[PDB]
């Protein structure tokens, strides 16, 4: 049982860094600052980061390095009763790969479309335009970049819903193929090659962020955007919604208990200082988000100042921000083609090494549980990515966005929250902090402070519950603009979201009815960890 290991410390770090930072740092974090009181939002964000995200982040990394197995095996060895967490986690990572990678596909599509003297999303006199098109964002109107991304790139207007996916965009299917070809030839030999691909995919975003920061700040009106970005409004701290947005952002932007840090750390040396790794990577992830904020809003202020557009219409979140709003500003500045190609290549690398982690979480968790596919890695992941691609063509259809949007709001959003919730309960109460603090001490030489133990035991479950409850309160039958999803689409969504959580009692009830003795004598066998 002594497995492979990282061919260099940096390979692991850049793998965790690469996974942890993605488009969410770019397209969610700065918008929250803007929405929830600017710099004042850093206080609930920072506190939720200190007592919520980083403890959970540290926990999984320690769990990975210590037990040295993938998600399924590690949790089974930790608590036999709650082994389904491993399965719940893996198929979540499985569901996300179905829709997440198309964001990278969209990135490459814009990357190819940027090989022109004139960027095609500048004007409103193209074949794919409507009388409602205006050169930039406006209330009651559509923008040239919005109509380019919608009526040309997506051809979403030709879909009446999710029942009507329409024809297949083969220019998009090709890009999705290229995405998986990269993903294939980065993960098929394991961390020996993956730990090298992340040297580009995790470092290029910082190369791009740097010169997009310079170009962003050199622009007229840049300082105006920084005002919109970080002008403190501490009244927000008194609001419970701000804390919930902070808590939610911190959690999903660090990705703890998702089975990927677990898998990545499982290849670490046993006596590696994983505590220093947790703190270093957590900081870099949040620092990247902070820097990305300046990158985004420097251009946002430039638009509000020299392009005469309202700040309300451009300070947005999600794919609307980098596929519509930001490229719209790029096409107006000198050397537009250069900044376009680099931006889009940033967003691509920003998602790639995250997609690596998600997939690797699956492949590692399965190789440790099933030797059949550990011996045949390349064959398995080829079948895996082929499966991804085949159904991924549905995301490449005219109504492909409707498919993407459904999974996004159901596939992993709620499932992983109650999954990680059971993780915190399992290690801090079933497995106990006592035994976990002991494990960590044997590794890095010293036990966690009383701080981490309190956080793992009391703060983390409340933190996770504070988010799950919050996403439930703000629930709303799935819609997009005017379009309202049919009831069955919403029902299917809860099935996908439910097919993960149901693994928790399913195997619990299963392994219970597989045990000799009495009811009190089932829990002890299924409570006692693997180390015996």
């Amino acid at each position: 049982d002594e497995r492979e290991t990282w061919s260099g410390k940096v390979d692991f770090l850049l793998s965790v860094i690469g996974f942890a930072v993605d488009l969410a740092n770019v397209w969610r974090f700065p918008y929250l600052c803007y929405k929830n009181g600017g710099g004042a939002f850093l206080v609930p964000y920072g506190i939720m980061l200190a007592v919520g995200g980083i403890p959970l982040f540290y926990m999984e990394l320690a769990l990975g390095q210590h037990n040295r197995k993938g998600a399924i095996t590690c949790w089974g060895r930790l608590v036999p009763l709650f082994k389904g967490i491993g399965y719940a986690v893996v198929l979540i990572a499985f569901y996300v790969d179905f829709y997440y990678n198309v964001i990278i596909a969209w990135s490459l599509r814009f990357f190819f479309a940027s090989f022109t003297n004139s960027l095609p999303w500048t004007s409103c006199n193209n074949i794919w335009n409507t009388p409602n098109c205006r050169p930039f964002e406006s209330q009651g109107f559509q923008s040239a970049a919005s109509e380019y991304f919608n009526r040309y790139i997506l051809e979403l207007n030709r879909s009446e819903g999710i029942h009507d996916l329409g024809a297949i965009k083969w220019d998009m299917a090709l890009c999705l193929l290229i995405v998986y070809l990269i993903c294939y030839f980065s993960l098929w030999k394991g961390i020996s090659t993956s730990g090298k691909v992340v040297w580009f995919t995790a470092l290029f975003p910082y190369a791009a962020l740097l010169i997009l920061l310079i170009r962003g700040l050199t622009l007229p009106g840049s300082f105006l955007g920084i005002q919109y970005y970080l002008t403190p409004n501490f009244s927000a701290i008194y609001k419970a919604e701000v804390w919930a947005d902070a808590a939610t952002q911190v959690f999903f932007s660090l990705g703890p208990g998702f089975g990927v840090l677990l898998a990545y750390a499982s290849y670490n040396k046993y006596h590696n200082n994983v505590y220093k790794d947790a703190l270093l990577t957590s900081f870099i992830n949040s620092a990247t988000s902070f820097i990305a904020g300046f990158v985004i809003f420097s251009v946002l202020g430039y638009m509000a100042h020299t392009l005469g557009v309202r700040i309300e219409d451009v300070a947005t979140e999600g794919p609307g921000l980098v596929f519509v709003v930001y490229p719209a500003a790029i096409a107006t500045m000198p050397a537009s083609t250069f900044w376009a190609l680099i931006f889009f290549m940033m967003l691509a690398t920003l998602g790639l090494d995250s997609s690596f982690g998600g997939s690797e979480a699956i492949i590692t968790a399965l190789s440790d549980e099933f030797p059949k596919i550990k011996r045949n890695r390349e064959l398995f992941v080829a079948g895996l990515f082929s499966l991804y691609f085949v159904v991924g063509l549905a995301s490449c259809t005219q109504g492909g966005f409707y498919f993407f949007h459904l999974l996004d709001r159901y596939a992993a959003g709620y499932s992983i929250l109650v999954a990680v919730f059971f993780e915190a309960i399992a290690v801090s109460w079933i497995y106990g902090t006592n035994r976990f603090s002991e494990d960590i001490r044997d590794m890095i030489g010293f036990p966690p402070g009383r701080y981490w133990q309190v956080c793992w035991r009391f703060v983390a479950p409340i933190f996770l519950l504070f988010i799950t409850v919050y996403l439930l309160i703000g629930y709303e039958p799935l819609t997009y603009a005017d379009y309202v999803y049919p009831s069955w689409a919403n029902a299917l969504g809860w099935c996908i979201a439910g097919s993960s959580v149901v693994m928790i009692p399913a195997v619990a009830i299963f392994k219970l009815l597989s045990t000799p003795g009495s009811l009190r004598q089932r829990f002890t066998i299924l409570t006692t960890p693997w180390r015996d």
Partner: antibody, heavy 119, light 109 residues
Framework: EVQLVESGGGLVKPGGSLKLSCAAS????????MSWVRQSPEKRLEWVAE????????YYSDTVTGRFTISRDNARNILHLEMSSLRSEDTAMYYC????????????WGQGTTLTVSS | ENVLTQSPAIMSTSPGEKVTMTCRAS???????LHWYQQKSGASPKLWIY???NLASGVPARFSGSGSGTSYSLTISSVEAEDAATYYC?????????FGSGTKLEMKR
């Protein structure tokens, strides 16, 4: 406040068997890893065995391994060291010592207890 | 095992003198894993200097340590008469844990 007292020890013929103990008081004993360190006649220090805070991690020295066994009682706060197949090289002042943190070493030592192995 | 060798074995010192005893390892030791102990006659050892730089509590400022890899040392700025003891270096880098041969401080007259 912190106090460690070793008991047992004494004269033992080669091949003999004895169980050393250490009573701890003044701290959460279940929260710290204990070690046995023995001193030569010559007043040289030699580490014998380490046991973790929950006893789930055990380490022995090459001279000691296979013969001695370090134990724990977190209920009564007692550290134990059973010795068997005793040799004349095991003659030493055996110290109850505790360090949780590798980085800080053994911050507390017991008064010790003398074991003599001779024919 | 990683055997630690201390020199000198015996050191004659008058109070007020600056002295430096060395601890040499056969294998590389992490700076945060080498420690120093003082042992008075007829007493149990006390943690003196942990991680080769940090004095334990009660330890006078006159004591200090330095070193890295396979060469460390305990240095006293100004020896006092109450320093007449034996000083042991110990590594907790790898198992088995090993102590140094020891350095004994004796006074002059």
């Amino acid at each position: 406040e912190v106090q460690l007292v070793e008991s047992g020890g004494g004269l033992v013929k080669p091949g003999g068997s004895l169980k050393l103990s250490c009573a701890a008081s003044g701290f959460t004993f279940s929260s710290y890893a204990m070690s046995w360190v023995r001193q030569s006649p010559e007043k040289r220090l030699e580490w014998v065995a380490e046991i973790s805070s929950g006893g789930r991690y055990i380490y022995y020295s090459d001279t000691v391994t296979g013969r001695f066994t370090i134990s724990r009682d977190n209920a009564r706060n007692i550290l134990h060291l059973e010795m068997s197949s005793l040799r004349s090289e095991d003659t030493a002042m055996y110290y109850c010592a505790r360090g949780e943190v590798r980085q800080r070493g053994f911050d507390y030592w017991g008064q010790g207890t003398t074991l003599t192995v001779s024919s | 095992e990683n055997v630690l060798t201390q020199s000198p074995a015996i050191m004659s010192t008058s109070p007020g003198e600056k002295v430096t005893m060395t601890c040499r390892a056969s294998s590389s030791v992490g700076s945060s894993y080498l420690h120093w102990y003082q042992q008075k006659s007829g007493a149990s050892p006390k943690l003196w200097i942990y991680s080769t730089s940090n004095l334990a509590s009660g330890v006078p400022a006159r004591f200090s340590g330095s070193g890295s890899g396979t060469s460390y040392s305990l240095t006293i700025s100004s020896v006092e008469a109450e320093d007449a003891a034996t000083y042991y270096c110990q590594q907790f880098s790898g198992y088995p844990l090993t102590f140094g041969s020891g350095t004994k401080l004796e006074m002059k007259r």
